[PDB]
């Protein structure tokens, strides 16, 4: 039948892709960076502790000014913190308490949230009445919302559990573009620094690179053995990091179109919830299910330090724009700033 | 406060007011009864609903308590990716239809509905998140099932069975079959009720089970256990 011919052609294409990727691997990243000096031991201590959430904290995000942050908890609360003075700026009660994602607009005028209600809610912060009110309610996904990211004041990108991603025009509340191709729940997304492409990681143990305007999949990266939970983009914009349930982190290059480095240890067997990069891109911070955060030398693939101050699973972490601190949230209803 | 300016002091006062509001809301929501509905296929959800896409929430007050009821039957995604969001609910109400003892699924051959319901109970009961959560097992359609034994014996579900073909014992055999799936018989137990058409015993049994669960939760908090 025609389906047999088509699947044989697909297998031939896969073999050709594998051969093309194999022919490009002459040297490894470890060999090239074998003689570079190590970073030593990274010692960081807690400076601030933000209290006020009475349930598990599920997401957090940093502002562009590197002073305000937002955090969502599964008690129907979206709290905006001023980290310098620990003061609370705003507390927003959500209509649905099963929130699972957060986003802060780059301009600082809007916040976005969503979760098990299959709806992305956009709240306006600057009003003439002095209260934060719901400005938009985007609907159309058929699965729980897992990640959302602003592009500007009038464009958002969301990923959800129906194996699809969407680009929404906020003003009209319509799905401008739909990205399809994943065979499992999409768990994370990350925008490029120039905001023209984005990478998405799903439960089919694969990551995909999407062009925002064209809505087409450019490259697919494989290698993980379980569901991918976190994805982060390298500061340069030519590589990215992936964390999954098999207790390993991996680094992928866009131009080489293959894998570069693997970060794993024999004493780590739990899953990874979050990944982030430092300002220069030399350190990679990953939060684990064993209540810890690990700092990895991104070049030599060596353990550098640990952050251990949480009594439950670490669920989210983020590095400020100027790289002066790192914020870590956890299921024990606390957030901590480290530097 | 020695060096704080006027606006800094006002911001601190605003944050204090926000904290007070958060504390009040948390202490109000702490004394609430939250139930999670579970089942396989269509076995009775609206009928279990007694006002006395996404996730469906139902709020009702019985005597002076606030009852929240969460139904996630419309979620078609992977269960293991959000099942930890409900770690901390007061009780899990699992509904099972007794009429599925002889009729199998037509979508997939040899997939009996009762056997397909036992696997879900096995997964939910023995879970890393629900080790201590109380489970209330409802066995619905008792009457309609009762008259079906006259034609098809229980061997259609469990061929390794021999006993009187009456309701009063065949139903108890299923009662035992579902209860033995629990591998944590100590420090955890199941309250099983046979659903009746009187429309009042269901809420009374649920209230009794919830009261017994809250008593054991209070025992741990006040250092007696």
């Amino acid at each position: 039948s025609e389906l047999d011919q088509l699947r044989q052609e697909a297998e031939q294409l896969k073999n050709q892709i594998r051969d093309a990727r194999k022919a490009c691997a002459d040297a490894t990243l470890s060999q090239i960076t074998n003689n570079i000096d190590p970073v030593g031991r990274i010692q960081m201590r807690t400076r601030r502790t933000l209290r006020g959430h009475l349930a598990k904290i599920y997401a957090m995000h940093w502002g562009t000014d590197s002073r305000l942050l937002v955090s969502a908890s599964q008690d129907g609360k979206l709290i905006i913190w001023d980290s310098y003075t620990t003061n609370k700026v705003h507390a927003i009660p959500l209509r649905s308490s099963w929130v699972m994602t957060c986003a802060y607009a780059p301009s600082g005028n809007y916040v976005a949230c969503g979760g098990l209600d299959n709806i992305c809610s956009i709240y306006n912060l600057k009003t003439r009445e002095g209260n934060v009110r719901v400005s938009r309610e985007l609907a159309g996904h058929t699965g729980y919302l897992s990640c959302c990211r602003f592009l500007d004041d009038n464009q958002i990108v969301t990923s959800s559990g129906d194996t699809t991603c969407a680009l929404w025009d906020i003003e009209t509340g319509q799905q401008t573009t739909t990205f399809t191709g994943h065979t499992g729940d999409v768990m994370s997304l990350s925008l490029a620094p120039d905001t023209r492409l984005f990478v998405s990681g799903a439960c089919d143990a694969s990551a995909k690179l999407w062009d925002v305007r064209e809505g087409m999949c450019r490259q697919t990266f494989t290698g993980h053995e379980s569901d991918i939970n976190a994805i982060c983009f390298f500061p340069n914009g030519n590589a990215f990091a992936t964390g999954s349930d098999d207790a390993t982190c991996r680094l992928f290059d866009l131009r080489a179109d293959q894998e570069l480095m693997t970060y794993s240890h024999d004493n780590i067997i739990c899953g990874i919830t979050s990944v982030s990069f430092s300002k220069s891109g030399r350190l990679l911070l990953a939060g684990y299910d064993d209540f810890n955060c690990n700092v990895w030398d991104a070049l030599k693939a060596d353990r550098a330090g640990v952050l251990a101050g949480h009594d439950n699973r670490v669920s989210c972490l983020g590095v400020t724009d100027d790289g002066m601190a790192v914020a870590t949230g956890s299921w024990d209803s606390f957030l901590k700033i480290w530097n | 406060g020695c060096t704080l300016s006027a606006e800094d002091k006002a911001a601190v006062e605003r944050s204090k007011m926000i904290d007070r509001n958060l504390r009040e809301d948390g202490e109000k929501a702490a004394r609430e009864v939250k139930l999670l509905l579970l089942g396989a296929g269509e076995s009775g959800k609206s009928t279990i609903v007694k006002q006395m896409t996404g996730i469906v929430e139902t709020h009702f007050t019985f005597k002076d308590l606030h009852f929240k009821m969460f139904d996630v039957g419309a979620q078609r995604s992977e269960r293991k990716k959000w099942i930890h969001c409900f770690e901390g609910v007061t009780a899990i109400i699992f509904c099972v239809a007794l009429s599925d003892y002889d009729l199998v699924l037509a979508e997939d051959e040899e997939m009996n509905r009762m056997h397909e319901s036992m696997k879900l109970f096995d997964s939910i009961c023995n879970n890393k998140w629900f080790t201590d959560t109380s489970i209330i097992l409802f066995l619905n359609k008792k009457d309609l099932f009762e008259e079906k034994i006259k034609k098809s014996p229980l061997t259609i579900c469990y061929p390794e069975y021999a006993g009187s073909n009456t309701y009063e014992e065949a139903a108890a055999y299923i009662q035992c079959q579902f209860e033995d799936l629990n591998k944590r018989k100590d420090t955890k137990e199941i309250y099983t009720h046979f659903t009746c058409s009187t429309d009042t015993e269901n809420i009374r049994f649920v209230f009794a089970a919830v009261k017994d669960t809250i008593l054991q939760l209070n025992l741990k908090e006040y250092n007696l256990v």
Partner: single-chain antibody
Amino acid sequence: VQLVESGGGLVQPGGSRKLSCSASGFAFSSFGMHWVRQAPEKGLEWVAYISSGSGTIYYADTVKGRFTISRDDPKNTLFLQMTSLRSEDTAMYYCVRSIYYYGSSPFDFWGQGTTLTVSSSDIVMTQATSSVPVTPGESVSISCRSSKSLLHSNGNTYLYWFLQRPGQSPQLLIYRMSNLASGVPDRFSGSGSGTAFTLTISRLEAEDVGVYYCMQHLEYPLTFGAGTKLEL
């Protein structure tokens, strides 16, 4: 957003009265409130302040022990009860809203005040100008000076620039010496140092005529400048 004042009228010396300010169109309970009075032909003068939640109250030295400020939040109203009124208390009173958090703009709305006529350590803000004859289409520069340093240890300089058009309530132009208020054209700019401050207007549009005031918010006894008048 609206604030409406009621009260005023002829009062004999030694009498009492209750001025009221009714708010509509915004969350009243989230805003701190000020009473600010202006004499018949004088400059602005701060009178009293009540915090959100009524947790903090501040009075001026002239009215301390005589005036009382209160708020009713369910009714969305603000009261000023005045007793033992002297002949120097004849003025127009405004109720002003102000909210304080990181990045907020206090003093951003002024009600249309009510007139009262009675029958017959502190930072000093100097505006050493009275009248500036001007022509449309040319830049202007108003200057204000303080007797202290308004720059705090956290890098914030607490200076505010307000404009009062003839026959209108004052409106906010600049807050914290550099931040332009919402709804203000880009022509207005603020700059300065710890002590000397300058407000620059790039191109006049024959509408900016009026009196410009500089106010300090470093410490709660609030001081206004004498004011600078722009006439053509």
